[PDB]
Design an enzyme around this catalytic site. Structure first.
Site, PDB file in Angstrom:
ATOM      1  CB  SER A 168      85.214   7.533  53.166  1.00 43.08           C
ATOM      2  OG  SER A 168      84.525   8.461  52.333  1.00 43.08           O
TER       3      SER A 168
ATOM      4  CE  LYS B  49      85.843  11.167  54.590  1.00 47.99           C
ATOM      5  NZ  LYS B  49      84.463  11.101  54.028  1.00 47.99           N
TER       6      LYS B  49
ATOM      7  CB  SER C 259      81.582   9.003  55.526  1.00 50.44           C
ATOM      8  OG  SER C 259      82.695   8.632  54.743  1.00 50.44           O
TER       9      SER C 259
ATOM     10  CD  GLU D 120      86.593  12.328  50.343  1.00 46.47           C
ATOM     11  OE1 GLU D 120      86.034  12.301  49.220  1.00 46.47           O
ATOM     12  OE2 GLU D 120      86.658  11.327  51.093  1.00 46.47           O
TER      13      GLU D 120
ATOM     14  CE  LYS E 272      84.711   6.939  57.342  1.00 45.29           C
ATOM     15  NZ  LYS E 272      83.527   6.370  56.571  1.00 45.29           N
ATOM     16  CB  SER E 273      81.813   2.284  55.236  1.00 43.66           C
ATOM     17  OG  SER E 273      81.231   3.498  55.658  1.00 43.66           O
ATOM     18  N   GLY E 274      83.886   2.861  53.005  1.00 45.57           N
ATOM     19  CA  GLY E 274      84.292   3.714  51.891  1.00 45.57           C
ATOM     20  C   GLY E 274      83.560   3.348  50.617  1.00 45.57           C
ATOM     21  CB  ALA E 275      81.306   4.374  48.424  1.00 44.93           C
TER      22      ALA E 275
END
Ligand code: CL
Length: 261
Positions: free
Chosen positions: A45, A48, A103, A139, A207-210
């Site tokens: 993510s 984004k 997110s 996504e 901005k985080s992601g997983a």
């Protein structure tokens, strides 16, 4: 601290049973910190925030008030904002904000759509001279992160350079660069990540992601007090498809960058 920082980063990989990719640049001194910064990771993510930047390049501030509609069957898993406004749609700015702040994955897919899909996203980054990032899927399939599979992957160095261009550089006019950084600030998704690893008088827009294979990422513009910003990209992944992740790994890597800069 070239070899000194290498040792600390190598030690975190062992303590957290993971692979780590780091790139940070101090925009005031152009000092860089890097570790496995040319290795590919699934970006998940974190795209984004960059896709919101492409959206802002391609659309007026005025047009962010335009209503966008979608259908119930367009909703993908984890769409906590977009699932509430199917009947009415949302303002385009609200969708971009939902993708950056929460997110929201349907919001990510709308962002994609508005900038020409994954291929359009990639073409915009190539225009800015990013030759590395590969965008292929929407996504949530973009999170598959199969080791060795370069679909929907980039490097810490490439991602940080892109974020630098949008947030401090010349990829956006000032007013939109401000809109982007505000969307990135104050979001709970970032609280245990780069924000948890900087001193309390620093400010973080992240901005985080997983993703699958234990993929866990955070990218940020961070402002030390009275100081030009530092751009940080921290990527992480594991060898097992169903692996878990540990926010603390990102926070400890951040502590290493802070001490080195
Ligand atoms: Cl519908």
């Amino acid at each position: 601290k070239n070899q000194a920082t290498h040792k600390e980063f190598s030690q975190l990989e062992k303590k957290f049973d993971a692979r780590l990719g780091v790139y940070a640049i101090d925009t005031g001194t152009n000092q860089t910190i890097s570790y496995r910064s040319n290795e590919r990771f699934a970006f998940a993510s974190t795209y984004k925030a960059l896709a919101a930047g492409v959206l802002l390049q391609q659309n007026s501030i005025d047009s962010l008030n335009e209503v966008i509609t979608y259908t119930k069957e367009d909703l993908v898993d984890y769409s906590p904002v977009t699932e509430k406004h199917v009947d009415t749609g949302m303002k385009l700015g609200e969708i971009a904000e939902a993708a950056v702040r929460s997110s929201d994955n349907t919001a990510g897919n709308i962002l994609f759509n508005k900038i020409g899909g994954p291929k359009g996203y990639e073409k915009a980054l190539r225009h800015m001279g990013d030759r590395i990032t590969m965008s292929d899927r929407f996504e949530t399939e973009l999170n598959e992160a199969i080791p060795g599979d370069i679909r929907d992957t980039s490097t810490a160095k490439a991602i940080a350079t892109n974020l630098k261009a949008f947030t401090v550089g010349n990829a956006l006019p000032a007013e939109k660069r401000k809109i982007l950084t505000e969307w990135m600030k104050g979001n709970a998704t970032g609280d245990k990540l780069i924000r948890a690893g900087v001193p309390t008088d620093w400010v973080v827009g992240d901005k985080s992601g997983a993703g699958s294979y234990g993929t866990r990422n955070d990218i940020a513009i961070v402002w030390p007090p009275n100081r030009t910003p530092i751009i940080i990209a921290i990527l992480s992944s594991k060898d097992e498809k169903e692996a878990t992740y540990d926010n603390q790994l990102i926070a400890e890597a951040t502590e290493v960058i802070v001490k080195a800069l």
